[PDB]
């Protein structure tokens, strides 16, 4: 009748989009990067070790100053770390002990956390009373908060278990724009340096591009075959990489609608839980589930450096904005800072 | 040493925070996480209300104090997600509490009864590698309703394995418990079970004994006694 015709038209449209993407694939990066010398092998040492958590942690986020950290654990405590002097700046009690994400504002005035409580609490670090208390409860989500990112002092994008993303306003306390279109459950978020647009990944192996101002999807990436729970923009902002559960990373291109290289090896079977980029973008860092962290070259797809740190799931890979340190937490309630 | 006054004061504040965190960890050493799982038709809400009476959206916790030890159950039934991305947060629980309705062996959409869905959920939750060191508690509510309902519906029409006392109101319950226990894999995990009604006084005492036995078995594994 009409539903079958619409479905077959959509399938044909997807097929012709794939054909157009294949048509413009003039040459990959393998045949054009043979003229440059590879980086080779690099070694990173654990310069700092932050051990003050009781339960397993799942989230971390660096600051603009590249010195303050925030980590969320299952003990119901949010504490601010010092990357230089190895001290706890704050200790925020949590009304809910089940949180899976945390966000640090670029200005450092506010910190947000979320998880199984379906409430994205906002804590005001710069409180006139000294103690850090909650400021606004971003309630109204039917799923578990998976990721949280700050793009402004009054705007925050939060993913949840309802297979959608929402843009919230702390002052009003209500969501502004809802990003619908994700068939799978979104798990990770990444904000572009221009802040105008952001990309998200879900359980349907699809990376959907979204715009903060527009509020509706513009670009769709389908290169993986398993659940995707890690994403990070390129420093240039024209590309991004996703970390899925089948031990693979693809450098998807915004202007090409296709992946560049596959960052995988036959010696890894576990999944990926967190991916991040360096300041230059030449070095790609991925957090695997093999009790180890691996480093991939964005232009040669080689395992240029292995980070033998913790002994449990990492889930807390991050890089400073100025590319000075690489903090790497894990379920063992430990934060290792690499350089 | 070389630290300044601001550095010394910040270090002192960090040490105070560490002391507070250590005290909180010591306090939390006397509380155990009990993952509560069940369908919406299993009477979870009235179950928690009855437990609260006997004692005296986002998830919710119910702390109870008995003999100076704290028990809390997390109600994750409101989560509609795939459950395969946040179930690892409950890896370090002591026991898993299951509530299965005794009057749902005939109620069904996809030509499947609720008992089949409960069995599938139990099978897919026991096999999870996260719950390898946690015991299982299988509560069975609406016991009185089963006695009256068994006179109308029969388990033979749905499960072709119930042979014997077809109309007894005492053998079908043992049979469903037995087949539920049969879902245990080769890894021998203790599955505690109780036959609770709408109004009872042993509802909290059974779970107290079950968590006590679970902690005893965990200590036996820790103490090299099996």
């Amino acid at each position: 009748s009409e539903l079958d015709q619409l479905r077959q038209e959509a399938e044909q449209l997807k097929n012709q989009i794939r054909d157009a993407r294949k048509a413009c694939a003039d040459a990959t990066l393998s045949q054009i990067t043979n003229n440059i010398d590879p980086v080779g092998r690099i070694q990173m040492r654990t310069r700092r070790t932050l051990r003050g958590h009781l339960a397993k942690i799942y989230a971390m986020h660096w600051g603009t100053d590249s010195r303050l950290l925030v980590s969320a654990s299952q003990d119901g405590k949010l504490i601010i770390w010092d990357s230089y002097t190895t001290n706890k700046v704050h200790a925020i009690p949590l009304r809910s002990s089940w949180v899976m994400t945390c966000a640090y504002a670029p200005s450092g005035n506010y910190v947000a956390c979320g998880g199984l409580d379906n409430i994205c609490s906002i804590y005001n670090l710069k409180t006139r009373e000294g103690n850090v208390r909650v400021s606004r409860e971003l309630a109204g989500h039917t799923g578990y908060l998976s990721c949280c990112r700050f793009l402004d002092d009054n705007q925050i994008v939060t993913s949840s278990g309802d297979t959608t993303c929402a843009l919230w306003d702390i002052e009003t306390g209500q969501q502004t724009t809802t990003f619908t279109g994700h068939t799978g459950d979104v798990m990770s978020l990444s904000l572009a340096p221009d802040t105008r647009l952001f990309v998200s990944g879900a359980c349907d192996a699809s990376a959907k591009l979204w715009d903060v101002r527009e509020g509706m999807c513009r670009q769709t990436f389908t290169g993986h075959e398993s659940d995707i729970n890690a994403i990070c923009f390129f420093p240039n902002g024209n590309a991004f990489a996703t970390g899925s559960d089948d031990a693979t990373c693809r450098l998807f291109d915004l202007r090409a609608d296709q992946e560049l290289m596959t960052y995988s090896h036959d010696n890894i079977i576990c999944g990926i839980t967190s991916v991040s980029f360096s300041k230059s973008g030449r070095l790609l860092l991925a957090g695997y589930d093999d009790f180890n962290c691996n480093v991939w070259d964005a232009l040669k797809a080689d395992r240029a450096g292995v980070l033998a740190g913790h002994d449990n799931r990492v889930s807390c890979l991050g890089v400073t904005d100025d590319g000075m340190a690489v903090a790497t937490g894990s379920w063992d309630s430990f934060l290792k800072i690499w350089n | 040493c070389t630290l300044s006054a601001e550095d010394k004061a910040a270090v002192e504040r960090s040490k105070m925070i560490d002391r507070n965190l250590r005290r909180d960890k010591r306090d939390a050493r006397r509380e155990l996480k009990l993952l509560l799982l069940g369908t919406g038709e299993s009477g979870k809400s009235t179950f928690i209300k009855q437990m609260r009476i006997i004692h005296g959206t986002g998830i919710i916790e119910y702390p109870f104090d008995l003999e100076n030890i704290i028990f809390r159950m997390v109600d994750v039934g409101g989560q509609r997600s795939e459950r395969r991305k946040w179930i690892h947060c409950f890896e370090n629980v002591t026991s898993i509490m299951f509530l299965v309705a005794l009057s749902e062996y005939d109620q069904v959409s996809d030509n499947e009864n609720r008992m089949e869905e409960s069995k599938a959920l139990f099978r897919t939750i026991i096999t999870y590698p996260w719950f390898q060191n946690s015991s299982v508690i299988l509560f069975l509510n609406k016991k009185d309703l089963l006695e009256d309902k068994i006179l109308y519906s029969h388990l033979v029409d749905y499960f072709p394995e119930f042979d014997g006392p077809q109309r007894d109101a005492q053998a079908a319950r043992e049979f469903i418990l037995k087949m539920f226990v049969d879902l245990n894999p080769d890894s021998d995990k203790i599955i505690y079970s109780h036959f609770t009604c709408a109004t009872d006084t042993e509802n909290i005492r059974f779970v107290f004994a079950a968590v006590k036995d679970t902690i005893l078995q965990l200590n036996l594994k820790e103490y090299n006694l099996v």
Partner: single-chain antibody
Amino acid sequence: DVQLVESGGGLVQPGGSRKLSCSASGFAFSSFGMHWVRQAPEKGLEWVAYISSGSGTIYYADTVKGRFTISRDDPKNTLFLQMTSLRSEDTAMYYCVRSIYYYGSSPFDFWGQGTTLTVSGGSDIVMTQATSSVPVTPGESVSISCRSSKSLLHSNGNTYLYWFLQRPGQSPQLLIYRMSNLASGVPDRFSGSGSGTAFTLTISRLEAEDVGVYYCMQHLEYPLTFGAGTKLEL
């Protein structure tokens, strides 16, 4: 709001003992390092005693070392101050001052109202304030210079220089809490600068509210010493 009101004040014969207590409300008293600064009638502010959070670190100035003791009652939410023997040099108006220390924190946020009572210097850093009164016109540019015995630039990379302004008839407030950053509740017309020793404070578009007495504080060395006191008069 943060409120710090003092009590236990009044005239007393020299050689006696007086109990001074300030009530804390509107803020976390258990997480703030309380101080004690007195305003001498013929001088400026000067630190007396300090207590950390939870009575952890208790330090005293060399002038009032041993003679003055400080104790806080966290459950009672009240800071106490006991003095063994009083003298003419201790006749001043003490300030119950709160302070919290961490990365990016602003020490000496709120100053107590204070109470008045009457009777009837080694290895320290001194602030050299050559000027005492700077007559200026409203809306003009005002520059105030300060200096210390030794450079305040530590290995971390920032100098520990504090600026204060005491309005006539009320407690002072914090203006600058580091080398070149602004505190909370302070208009953005202030802009500190320097090169390690030549501390300066640039003020643009000065209003009639800036007639208070300025103060210069160092914090690289723990003993807190205020400046001479630059009283701006229109």
